[PDB]
């Protein structure tokens, strides 16, 4: 077997699990983008990327088992449900959480506003490059990827222009301009700094915990700070197992996933390498929920929202990453970056149309709302009486008029017949509304 | 474009009429010397680019004519015929106008550059230039030198810029919000000026 997982997960534990099952594990960089263009037997990744793969057909529709379905949490199965079919085996539930230093501070900050004072006193730093880490602050005040109504995601409605998204992004860039976080800090810098204790607190998921455990500095895992009196809403990840469409060993890989990996022993051997977080298996999750960090992850997931499985999530992630990088580096303002994100999300726009709208946003931000409205309009456009019978000696015919009274109606008909040179006896049928003159 | 030409010619006519009346009557009583000082400072600040980069003979010639006529009016009021001038009734505080106008020019200007700051300051000071004259007439109650021709030409000047702004906004799609607002303030002040003159002098 050939397996691709991210570099920050427990690839060694997966290696021993495959050893007991040959199974090869690899952790290429940018694999969430490598996989579609390259096509590995089974790929381990968050569910948001998987639905788009199912649109390409790269993931083979796998028939589940009712007992095996009941062996896992129902919402994890709901995550990998796209158009009524299951495309992946959920493995773990991961959510972002605050990891602070007990030595540096006893109580974590209850809100984002407290962070500037504590940081300037110490004189927080997380990975600002990926939008996954910077999204909880954006979504704390109502910014959303796609409007979720009655069980469906409305692609026509994107909430990255919300006042809450603007507030979160401007708070982040204010903290950047106040020298509280390095504009170009990334995951490696965040891990290195928090391991040495230089940074009191950082935002990260379960996987980093083992790394922090190597740093042997006492750390507390808890709720992400609230932004303007509202909780942070991190996207909830479901690390799931997807089968390749072109895998020659589809049945063997499926059996391996069901009978070695998604078991108590296999998941225990995987979580030891790197903390999987909230485990999909009922038994191991019950055995593991007693740990306070797992409880913090689960409650943060409850405060957050799970990512949509729709295929418009890769474009959304690219657009939000571009906007966050632009706002953080200072190349562009917050509002301009969010308008760029909206333009880049719009799927039906042609490349040259999108470039034109982006240029229009660049060179005049006073009418950004009107430019966005016109771009959305273009995007939606490119989405894939009384009657007379006369019987004379020479002329015969019929004629209809608009009359409310029959007396005036027959007066008009008599005048018309005189104008037509007609002279004869008159009859009226009121039921048929017909005046008949005949000679 | 003829509306702005006609308004500027009417303003120059008003200035020339006032200067000639002061010269002929051998007195400047009834005129606020502080208002004319503010007008002179408006023309000085707006036309400081007279020395450098002349655009046309009409342009620089009109700038020089305005500056010279206003300076001559100030000289006649304060130097030549200062004996007839009555500063007792012209007690208005000029700094109370210049300082807020300077601050407002710093704050509300389009762009923060010395020439743009100077132009905005001149526009605002022109908008509030006539206030000392209004106060002087409101106190004394008469204007021995203000004439019907002067007021008529000033009102024609203001109405011509009003028509010019409407024409530019509706045909050329151009409006200068600072200029429009300051001109509206000046037009209201001039209407009050005409009201005071007709009700109290005539």
């Amino acid at each position, epitope marked *: 077997l050939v397996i691709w997982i991210n570099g920050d997960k427990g690839y060694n534990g997966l290696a021993e699990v495959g050893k007991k099952f040959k199974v090869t594990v690899e952790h290429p960089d940018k694999l969430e983008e490598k996989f579609p263009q390259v096509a590995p037997d089974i790929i381990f990744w968050a569910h948001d990327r998987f639905g788009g793969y199912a649109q390409s057909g790269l993931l083979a529709e796998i028939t589940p088992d009712k007992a095996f379905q009941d062996k896992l949490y129902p919402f994890t199965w709901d995550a990998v449900r796209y158009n009524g079919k299951l495309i992946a085996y959920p493995i773990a539930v991961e959510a972002l959480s605050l990891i602070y230093n007990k030595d540096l501070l006893p109580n974590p900050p209850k809100t984002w506003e407290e962070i500037p004072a504590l940081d300037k006193e110490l004189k927080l730093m997380f990975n600002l490059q990926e939008p996954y880490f910077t999204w909880p602050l954006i979504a704390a005040d109502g910014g959303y990827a796609f409007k979720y109504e009655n069980g469906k995601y409305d692609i026509k409605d994107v909430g990255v222009d919300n006042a809450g998204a603007k507030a979160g992004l401007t708070f982040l860039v204010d903290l950047i301009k106040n020298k509280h976080m390095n504009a170009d800090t990334d995951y490696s810098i965040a891990e290195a700094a928090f391991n040495k204790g230089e940074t009191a607190m950082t935002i990260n998921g379960p996987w980093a915990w083992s790394n922090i455990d190597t740093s042997k500095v006492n750390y507390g895992v808890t709720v992400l700070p609230t932004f303007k009196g509202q909780p942070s809403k991190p996207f909830v990840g479901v690390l799931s197992a997807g089968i390749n469409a072109a895998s020659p060993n589809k049945e063997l890989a499926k059996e391996f996933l069901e009978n070695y990996l998604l078991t108590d022993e296999g998941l225990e051997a995987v979580n030891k390498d790197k903390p999987l977080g909230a485990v999909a298996l009922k038994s191991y999750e019950e055995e593991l929920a007693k740990d306070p960090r797992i409880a913090a992850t689960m409650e943060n997931a409850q405060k957050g929202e799970i990512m949509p499985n729709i295929p418009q999530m890769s474009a959304f992630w690219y657009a939000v990453r571009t906007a966050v990088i632009n706002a953080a580096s200072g190349r562009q303002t917050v509002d301009q970056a969010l308008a760029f994100a909206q333009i880049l999300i719009m799927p039906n726009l*042609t490349e*040259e*149309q999108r*470039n*034109g*709208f982006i*240029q*229009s946003l660049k*060179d*005049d931000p*006073s*009418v950004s709302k*009107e*430019i966005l*409205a*016109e*771009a959305k*309009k*273009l995007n939606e*456009h*490119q989405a894939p009486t009384y009657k007379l019978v006369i019987n004379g000696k020479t002329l015969k015919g019929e004629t209809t008029t608009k009359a409310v009274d029959a007396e005036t109606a027959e007066k008009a008909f008599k005048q018309y017949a005189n104008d037509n040179g007609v002279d004869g006896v008159w009859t009226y049928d009121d039921a048929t509304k017909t005046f008949t003159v005949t000679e | *474009n*003829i509306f*702005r*030409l006609t308004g*500027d010619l009417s303003h120059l006519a008003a200035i020339i009429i006032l200067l000639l009346k002061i010269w002929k009557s051998r007195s400047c009583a009834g005129i606020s010397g502080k208002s004319q000082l503010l007008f002179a400072l408006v023309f000085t600040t*707006r*036309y400081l*680019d007279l020395f450098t*980069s002349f*655009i*046309s003979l*009409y*342009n620089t010639s*009109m*700038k020089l004519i305005y500056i010279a006529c206003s300076y001559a009016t100030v000289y006649l009021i304060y130097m030549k015929f200062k004996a007839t001038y009555d500063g007792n009734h012209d007690t208005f505080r000029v700094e109370f106008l210049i300082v807020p106008v300077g601050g407002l020019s710093f704050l509300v200007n*389009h*762009d923060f*550059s010395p*020439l*743009e700051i100077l*132009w905005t300051f001149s526009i605002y000071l022109e908008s509030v230039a006539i206030l000392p004259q209004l106060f002087m007439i409101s106190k004394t109650g008469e204007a021995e030198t203000i004439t019907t021709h002067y007021l008529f030409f000033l009102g024609l000047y203001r109405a011509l810029y009003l028509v010019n702004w409407i024409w530019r906004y509706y*045909f*050329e*799609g*151009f*409006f*200068d*919000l600072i200029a429009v607002v300051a001109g509206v303030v000046q037009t209201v002040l001039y209407c009050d000026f005409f009201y005071l003159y007709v009700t109290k002098v005539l």
Partner: nanobody
Amino acid sequence: QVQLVESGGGLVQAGGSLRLSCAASGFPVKRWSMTWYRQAPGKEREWVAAIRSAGHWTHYADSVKGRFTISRDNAKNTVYLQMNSLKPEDTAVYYCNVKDEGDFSYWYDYWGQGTQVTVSS
């Protein structure tokens, strides 16, 4: 004397994009205003967009607001009009007009030759 050259016009499909540019040659003025007009055959000349020399002020016609965007380049002494989501009703000859916004400069009012924009439905 100032000469105005307009470029960027051409034939574009409906819904496409275009970028017009008015470049002024001659001695620049401290304060000027440039207005993009359009004239279709047999129709009156209507203003499309308007920008000044300094500031963030831009004005757009009701028909083109949100689709057309006017910007300036003082360093290059140029003004650009970006046309997005073009429709065949936007077929016309587009002119650029430079006015001296300073005092006593009524005859500093220069027009471009004209550029042809044709939206093929």
